[PDB]
Design a protein around this ligand. Structure first.
Ligand SMILES: Brc1ccc(-c2c[nH]c([C@@H]3Cc4ccccc4CN3)n2)cc1
Ligand SMILES: Fc1ccc(-c2c[nH]nc2-c2ccnc(F)c2)cc1
Ligand SMILES: Fc1ccc(-c2c[nH]nc2-c2ccnc(F)c2)cc1
Length: 332
């Protein structure tokens, strides 16, 4: 067991191994607070997240377990990786805090209108990481610029920090379709890619109705083939009662963009999710000709998310989380 030290940063107490020095707060959200630190063991700058109230409720405890399981699985250049996970607890009985450590990245895409060469490389990386994530049967569901960490070298990693999320959300999610697929993430990437090219939010909807309205203005109201797939009477009544609109010509909307970026946007932002390009297909699109290497776009080990269906007690989720802390093997 490392020697731990304690301090207070912004009304939150931090108990971390002495390996990590010079903690400075960088931000805080609903599910944690984050510090930058220097990792004396590796010489790396790192980000340390202290989970907030990880075991307060069954719900929290399951969310904690979910986050740790996911982070322990991710082993890809374009997805956040876990460098360390620790707790100051010496036994299960006293276990009430979880800290996660990852490489510190310069900034995020929300901080960062870009050159086309930069767009190619950034979107290539997002899709490369998505091919990986999707191959594990995981859907990110909240892709947006602030969830894309980018260093000064333009290297990019997908994460979730857990600008409205709804702006990047697929139209089928606005409609509350229960059976959406992984291409909800492709929709988000199309929205991000548009914004990088234009410097403007593609669909800055004020609420879910407005969001759908703005979307359909670009991509057209549903065609007959898509309408046949809609099970909800009320949704069909609503959609069919709209003034019908054709799909816009993207070449005109994205005036003066690389025609290949236009073509890829068309393939990502098709309204019917069944017709959208997949991450793996997108990597092979001519837009990424300078980056694409089929022998360097790996898939993930399978990921068991059977736990999602389980209803367990707080202490059981806590013990499962503790098991995962203990079994953690740091990367080489
Ligand atoms: Br697909 C997918 C990929 C990643 C995530 C995820 C969960 N938690 C996080 C990071 C972990 C972390 C660790 C240290 C410092 C800050 C942060 C910020 N949240 N990413 C979820 C789904
Ligand atoms: F090889 C080394 C040894 C120590 C350091 C170091 C610099 N500042 N603080 C520390 C420190 C304090 C307590 N425990 C540690 F592991 C590190 C850096 C590299
Ligand atoms: F106004 C609309 C109508 C349909 C969609 C849509 C896009 N892809 N898939 C669907 C869909 C499929 C099955 N059932 C649903 F409810 C939705 C999105 C907005």
């Amino acid at each position: 067991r490392p020697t731990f030290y304690r301090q207070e940063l912004n009304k939150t107490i931090w108990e971390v191994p002495e390996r990590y020095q010079n903690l400075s707060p960088v931000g805080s959200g609903a599910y944690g607070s984050v510090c930058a630190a220097f990792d004396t063991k590796t010489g790396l700058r790192v980000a340390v997240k202290k989970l907030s109230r990880p075991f307060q409720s069954i719900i929290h405890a399951k969310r904690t377990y979910r986050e740790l399981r996911l982070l322990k699985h991710m082993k890809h250049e374009n997805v956040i990786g876990l460098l360390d996970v620790f707790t100051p607890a010496r036994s299960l009985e006293e276990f009430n805090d979880v800290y996660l450590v990852t490489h510190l990245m310069g900034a995020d895409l929300n901080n960062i209108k870009l050159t086309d060469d930069h767009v190619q490389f950034l979107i290539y990386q997002i899709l490369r990481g998505l091919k990986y994530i999707h191959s594990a049967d995981i859907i990110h569901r909240d892709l947006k610029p602030s969830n894309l960490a980018v260093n000064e070298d333009c290297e990019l990693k997908i994460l979730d920090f857990g600008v409205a999320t709804r702006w990047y959300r697929a139209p089928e999610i606005m409609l509350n379709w229960m059976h959406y697929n992984q291409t909800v993430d492709i929709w988000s990437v199309g929205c991000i890619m548009a914004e990088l090219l234009t410097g403007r939010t593609l669909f800055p909807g004020t609420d879910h109705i407005d969001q759908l309205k703005l979307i359909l203005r670009l991509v057209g109201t549903p065609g007959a083939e898509l309408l046949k797939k809609i099970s909800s009477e009320s949704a069909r009544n609503y959609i069919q009662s709209l003034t019908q609109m054709p799909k816009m010509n993207f070449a005109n909307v994205f005036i003066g963009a690389n025609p290949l970026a236009v073509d890829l946007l068309e393939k990502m932002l098709v309204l019917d999710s069944d017709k959208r390009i997949t991450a793996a297909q997108a990597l092979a699109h001519a837009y990424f000709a300078q980056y694409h290497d089929p022998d360097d776009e790996p898939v993930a080990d399978p990921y068991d998310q059977s736990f999602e269906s389980r209803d367990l007690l707080i202490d059981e989720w806590k013990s499962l989380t503790y098991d995962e802390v203990i079994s953690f093997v740091p990367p080489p």
